[PDB]
From a paper:
Here we report cryo-electron microscopic structures of the heme translocation complex CcmABCD from E. coli, alone and bound to the heme chaperone CcmE. CcmABCD forms a heterooctameric complex centered around the ABC transporter CcmAB that does not by itself transport heme. Our data suggest that the complex flops a heme group from the inner to the outer leaflet at its CcmBC interfaces, driven by ATP hydrolysis at CcmA. A conserved heme-handling motif (WxWD) at the periplasmic side of CcmC rotates the heme by 90° for covalent attachment to the heme chaperone CcmE that we find interacting exclusively with the CcmB subunit.
In our cryo-EM single particle data of the native complex, the two most highly resolved 3D classes contained the Ccm(ABCD)2 complex, but one of these additionally featured a prominent periplasmic domain that after refinement was modeled as CcmE with its N-terminal transmembrane helix. This helix interacted exclusively with helix hVI of CcmB, with the periplasmic domain of CcmE poised above the CcmBC interface on one side of the complex. 29 % of all particles used for the final refinement contained CcmE, and although at lower contour levels a second copy of the chaperone on the opposite side of the complex was apparent and the N-terminal helix of CcmE was visible in lower-resolution reconstructions during data processing, the relevant class predominantly contained a single copy of CcmE, with slightly lower local resolution and presumably substoichiometric occupancy. The transmembrane helix of CcmE was modeled from residue N2 to S32 and is followed by a short, flexible hinge preceding the β-barrel domain that commences at F37. The association of CcmE to the complex also did not seem to affect its structure, and there was no discernible change observed in CcmB. AlphaFold2 yielded a model of a symmetric Ccm(ABCDE)2 complex with a root-mean-squared deviation from the experimental structure of 3.1 Å for all atoms that also reproduced the observed association of CcmE to the heterooctameric core very well. However, the periplasmic domain of CcmE was rotated by about 90° towards CcmC, placing it above loop 5 and the WxWD motif of the latter.
Residue numbers in the entry:
A (entry chain B), F (entry chain b): 2 to 220
B (entry chain c), H (entry chain C): 3 to 243
C (entry chain d), I (entry chain D): 2 to 69
D (entry chain A), G (entry chain a): 1 to 203
E (entry chain E): 2 to 159
Write the structure that this text describes.
């Protein structure tokens, strides 16, 4: 039954298709903002490109996190998913996997445009796409406790960021260290291995602590 | 007079239905002549060589990507004062066309700047201004598509169109001053040799006609979308067969 | 009167052949996408009205069954 | 014994003591109706029996075991309908009802949606439907569900009279084979006083 | 029962996830695989573990190219050059094209096999875009031993 | 009666004071993000501090922007505020001014700390404080249409950013150009003059295009 | 002539024609009641009459002039109480009522909040109050307003019978002099039929 | 036993009531003697000179900035398994004290870093880790304030305290590795010259006692917040006089 | 046994005095603020319960007037 929830969340997201592009348009906004401030200088942009790419990724995923749970509270679907005959960790896992298929995959297909926009080479795009693939699920699993905690609040837009961003700090450091090593043409196997380790750890632990928060917010 | 009869949504539907074929064929004729007498039967720039033909594929894609937005304001203005709903459907009708023209302008500018600059994207003032224009088009489209009620979506889209039009000279001159401060640019958009000028103007008018055709057709699409229950679409579909 | 003497040389625009045809193709594609999207949208709205009004005719049939 | 037993449930919503010391046991095949006075708090009571809300004091029991342990067997035998219908407005009625178990084939689909009064509105999107007809897809979930426990938080809201008689007929039919329906309604209901049982959360 | 089945299945998922987490952490800490030595760490062993490099193990050496140590074979792509830290110096033999970034007095990293007598048969030489860059271990080697001149670490045979 | 609305909005915001600090904590987290990615190198951080400061300021104000109108829809106050015997432009002006006294003054008093964190000198702090003072009112007036239309939505978190930030691009360019002309010691009077000109223009034009916006968003 | 007058009011919420062609003129000193049949759509009429919602076609007039022009005089003579009470839950009851005009001094404060049933609960924050007592602050605004026109979307929602009696007595007192109250309510109200007038929005 | 009676809210109120004064006086004595033996009657480090006394005002302010959070974890754990509401109240009691200790540790670290680095904030690993810890404390406090119901706010705070403690060693070692590359750092926090050791330990124990006193008193504050109506407070206040 | 020979020299801690005394003041103030807020909050809650119970006694007196 775990796949039915995932497939249905994919169907509801794909019914209106326009709304899933707004995270990547916000990603392009934050992509655009910095070189307006800094300047069109290509060496400075080439060196700072990890900072713009991952701060944009964190903020785009973070603003996309509202669609993960805010819809089903008002529709009442969240309750009916909690009394489904299946442990609520699996329900959370299905929702976060659908959210990554709906928020992270647009960034991964959008990755050639941003890679050509800032000026990284094909190795830079390769490392940045692999690092996005290993990192944006971790954005989903660290954002799920914050959204589950802040779904009852009417004003839950700043505080959700306040909770999620210190959790995503280690992923920030390893991702930007990985692509800093990539711009110098070094092998980035170890950084991606730590990245997959954080992915597996958060994927294991985050449903079990999002389910309790989700039980907390509804009651 | 008949301008007041240009407000009844069915009458506007057969007016657009009658204006679609002729204007579309005139568009294809004018644009075919423009490209066939511009990408061939035409000289080339001395320094750029044979890469100057892109000045066709960019400049109707640029100016009208502004011009549609300017025309958008007119519709939005008709949406705010006289409270004409069909103008507020016209805003949503032209918004994807303006977005696509802007995206074409960005892509042609990048493909033009690669044989000069060495890279696909140098933050030139023109291309950054076009990127901000594309962002405003995306804002209008997402405003029209996030709402549930279509009428209120069109009126809201008109509101952000007027906001964008007021803020657009500020954005364009601020971006132009941004390139003035840091580092200059070459002569790219409208620094054009004679006898290659008529093809650009013919392509300008052809892109105008194609934008008018697409606008006049998505107007029918939106009118059919809202009046899905009133008996005139019933009479039209029983006429179909 | 063509500047390009050879018709085969026309497709290779003086060494700068990739960029011109790249933007030609990626201009032709979005216009085709717009035209196809709007035409299939018009057809889809018309067929949706057709299905809705056939279902309204079935509502009339149900009303006639209730009346009879 | 009876499966659903409530023992000394105490609830404070925003430091207002809604009810205290309330304890009621339900044997198989009764049709308890909550008859409380205040608008909010009987809804909190139904959420307290369904397991959405933890008891602040006391416990709810299903077949002799507390609700924090027997979730995977309790949720196999319940159907909960809130004030909100619990469905997705974006999907159509048929896929929303197909999300819940079975549906699909005609043995469990296209007459369940008909007996709620939504015959002929199966494939319309939900957001283009009236609010009562939006509640009628979740209310149509009754005819296909095998759960012995049904819990209903105003089922008869914006429902025409013939709908209410059909729902009460199917509902008493559920009551026959040992099925328990716990519900709150505002309207005076047209069922005999001998069959029903009233638990009032007084004060 | 169904409770035991659900708990056991999700616990199997939990232990698989934790095992793969620990596996990738230990892999990455091992995928540091610090074959990056300095010439002083070749001659006198690594500073922390005192382990000697063996003859014939594939390895990586960061060091500055000495002024006047690059002799190129005129008839082949064979280049022999000596690279140093501020603690020691090692010879390098490389067959192939050198990078255009390779100049004397600049930092390079040599991937190759160690021969007898602190000699390295390079399979690859990586010279950096930055003329003044020193690798972190090599930079700490010269900060510890206080910037002794390249002529001092030119081994006086050379 | 323009002042009673302003004083009441201050009383509501100051009655629970904690929520006011959440914009500046989001600001501080965004300042924390770019040193961790780019690096602790002080020459680069000193060069890039205008871009970090203004991307943080735009995003902090933009997420703070929800409290400008989202509270009054559910409480029903906003309808009554349109039915005060006062033109709704004045009501909008009072709310945006109270929001600036609630969102922007925390940034202006936090200004020494973020100036300390990024290595700017006393002249850099003076220009940074004056430029925030002349810019965050303009942030309020440009974001008031975005909040005004995106108050009726359930999903108004990414769309609000998409409408607001391209409007605030000229403020980005002029503010960070003033900051670049301040880091190298040149006088900065003309840049603040342009900032004041935009502030005057948007303060003139934003209530009149926010009132009809707020009339559409609820009917 | 009558001051509040409606001409050919048609409304289409989400492409559903709730009403069309409704046109009614209201002379001073009348207590018309909006009957209605659907739950939502009479609230839409009330919001359309106060001018929150524009007519899609047709127009509302106050004293012979359309509502898009005479706002500064219309809003000075109206009191609107929707389903939401319109008060801030963060502030106290007395300060919420003092936001609205007059109040303050004891000639217009501390009996207006008393006659609605909130005697002794003046200084408690609104968020620690029951929902009926939250609505009774906006209901307490009636005793201090100078507005001739009162428009009410469900004024009697969770108020006891004594509060309803007091509200109707004050409302009749307003009806004696020049002033129109328009209200919508579920409950059958205890005033004689001769005084009241019913405009029902037929389907 | 009496541990079960420890969960009774009035009984904990008088337990905290008689535990505040003695513990507070002891705290004052130990922390006072610690500072006077540390700031004088003690040597100073040879290289940094007399700026080394700051190692008191930082290091009890640093370690307990983690320690309170670790203790917060324990309370949060008691919140989730045994469902004791008072441990979730202890989380909210101990979050502001941890935040203030973290603020003291951070900006005293900046005051120590000025005579060495020349700037108030060189992005050292220790100050960055304490800044992230401060952000975690602010997240806990903001969750405790945003919610309306105090019990639900405490339970939400317990959830995020367990989240933060799960992810906190990852943050600390990632920041430590973040200045493994990108330059290094000196030996400052716990490189201590002997006989300047007992004052620092005694100040650690004094900061422990002060944290316990403030924790035990904001315990009483939040108890009086939650149980504002039940008659044990009534008997207490009629006993007041 | 004091390292600083002069008591006046102890106030000027070997030149590095501004940083140390700035920090001493900057740790004394927030702990004092925490204790002041923690005392004033307890006093304020007790006085708020006092006002609430005076109003409750007024409520009981009003009930007595309604009974009489």
């Amino acid at each position: 039954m775990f796949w039915r929830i995932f497939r249905l969340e994919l169907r509801v997201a794909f019914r209106h298709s326009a709304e899933i592009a707004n995270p990547l348009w916000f990603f392009l906004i934050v992509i655009t903002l910095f070189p307006l401030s800094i300047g069109p200088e290509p060496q400075l942009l080439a060196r700072i490109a990890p900072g713009i790419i991952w701060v944009a990724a964190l903020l785009s995923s973070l603003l996309a996190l509202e669609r993960l749970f805010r819809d089903d509270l008002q529709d009442g679907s969240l309750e009916q998913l909690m009394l489904l005959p299946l442990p609520l960790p699996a329900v959370v896992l299905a929702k976060v996997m659908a959210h990554w298929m709906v928020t992270g995959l647009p960034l991964l297909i959008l990755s050639p445009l941003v890679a050509m926009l800032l000026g990284m080479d094909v190795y830079g795009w390769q490392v940045m796409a692999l690092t996005l693939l290993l990192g944006t699920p971790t954005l989903g699993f660290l954002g799920a406790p914050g959204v589950a905690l802040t779904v009852g609040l009417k004003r839950g837009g700043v505080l959700l960021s306040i909770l999620v961003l210190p959790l995503t700090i280690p992923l920030l450091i390893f991702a930007t260290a990985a692509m800093d090593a990539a711009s110098m043409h070094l092998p980035v196997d170890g950084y991606l291995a730590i990245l997959g380790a954080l992915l597996a750890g958060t994927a294991t632990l985050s449903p079990f602590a999002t389910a309790a928060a989700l039980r907390i917010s509804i009651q | 007079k008949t301008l007041h009869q240009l407000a009844i949504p069915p009458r506007l539907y057969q007016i657009c239905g009658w204006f679609i074929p002729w204007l579309a064929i005139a568009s294809v004729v004018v644009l075919t002549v423009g490209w066939i007498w511009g990408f061939g039967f035409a000289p080339a720039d001395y320094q750029q060589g044979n890469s100057y033909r892109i000045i066709y594929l960019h400049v109707p894609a640029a100016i009208w990507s502004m011009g549609i937005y300017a025309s958008m304001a007119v519709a939005a203005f008709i949406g705010l004062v006289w409270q004409m709903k069909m103008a507020n459907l016209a805003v949503a009708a032209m918004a994807p066309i303006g977005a696509v023209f802007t995206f074409i302008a960005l892509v042609t500018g990048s493909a033009w700047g690669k044989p000069m600059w060495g890279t696909w994207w140098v933050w030139d003032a023109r291309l950054t201004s076009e990127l901000v224009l594309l962002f405003l088009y995306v804002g209008v489209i997402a405003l029209w598509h996030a709402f549930d009620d279509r009428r209120l979506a069109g009126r809201a889209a008109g509101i952000l169109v007027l906001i964008g039009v007021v803020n657009l000279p500020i954005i364009h001159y601020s971006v132009e001053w941004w390139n003035t401060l840091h580092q200059g640019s070459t002569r790219m958009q409208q620094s054009i040799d004679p006898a290659m000028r008529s093809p650009l103007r013919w392509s300008i008018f052809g892109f105008l006609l194609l934008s008018a055709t697409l606008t006049l057709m998505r107007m029918r699409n939106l009118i059919l979308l809202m009046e899905k229950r009133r008996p005139w679409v019933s009479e039209l579909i029983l006429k179909r067969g | 009167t063509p500047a390009f003497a050879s018709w085969n040389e026309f497709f290779a625009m003086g060494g700068y052949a990739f960029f011109v045809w790249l933007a030609v193709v990626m201009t032709v594609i979005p216009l085709v996408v717009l035209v196809v999207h709007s035409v299939m949208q018009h057809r889809a709205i018309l067929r949706g009205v057709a299905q809705q009004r056939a279902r309204e005719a079935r509502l009339r049939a149900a009303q006639q069954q209730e009346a009879a | 014994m009876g499966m659903l037993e409530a023992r000394e449930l105490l609830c404070e919503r925003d430091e207002r003591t809604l009810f205290s010391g309330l304890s009621f046991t339900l044997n198989a095949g009764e049709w308890v109706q909550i008859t409380g006075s205040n608008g909010a708090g009987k809804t909190t009571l139904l959420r307290l029996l369904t397991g959405l809300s933890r008891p602040d004091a006391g416990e709810v029991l299903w077949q002799g075991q507390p609700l924090h342990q027997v979730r995977d067997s309790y949720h196999q035998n319940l159907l909960w309908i809130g004030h909100q219908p619990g469905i997705k407005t974006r999907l159509t009625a048929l896929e929303n009802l197909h999300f819940y178990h079975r549906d699909g084939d005609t043995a469990q689909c296209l007459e369940a949606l008909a007996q709620a009064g939504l015959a002929g509105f199966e494939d319309i999107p939900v957001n283009q439907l009236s609010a009562g007809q939006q509640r009628r897809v979740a209310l149509a979930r009754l005819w296909l569900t095998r759960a012995t426990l049904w819990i209903l938080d105003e089922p008869f809201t914006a429902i025409d009279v013939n709908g209410v008689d059909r729902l009460t007929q199917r509902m008493a039919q559920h009551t026959e084979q040992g099925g328990i329906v716990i519900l709150t309604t505002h309207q005076p209901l047209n069922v005999a006083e001998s069959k029903i049982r009233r638990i009032s959360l007084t004060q | 029962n169904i409770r035991r089945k659900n708990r056991l299945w999700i616990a199997c998922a939990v232990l698989a996830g934790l095992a793969l987490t620990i596996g990738l952490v230990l892999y990455a800490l091992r995928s540091n695989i610090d074959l990056f030595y300095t010439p002083g760490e070749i001659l006198y062993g690594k500073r922390e573990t005192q382990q000697m490099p063996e003859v014939g193990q594939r390895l990586r050496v960061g060091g500055m190219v000495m002024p006047g140590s690059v002799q190129r074979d005129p008839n082949s792509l064979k280049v022999t050059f000596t690279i140093y830290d501020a603690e020691g110096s090692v010879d390098v033999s490389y067959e192939g094209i050198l990078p255009d970034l390779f100049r004397e007095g600049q930092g390079v990293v040599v991937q190759g096999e160690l021969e007898k007598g602190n000699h390295i048969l390079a399979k690859e030489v990586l010279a950096k875009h930055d003329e003044n860059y020193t690798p972190p271990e090599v930079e700490k080697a010269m900060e510890a031993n206080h910037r002794r001149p390249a002529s001092v670490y030119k081994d006086p045979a050379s």
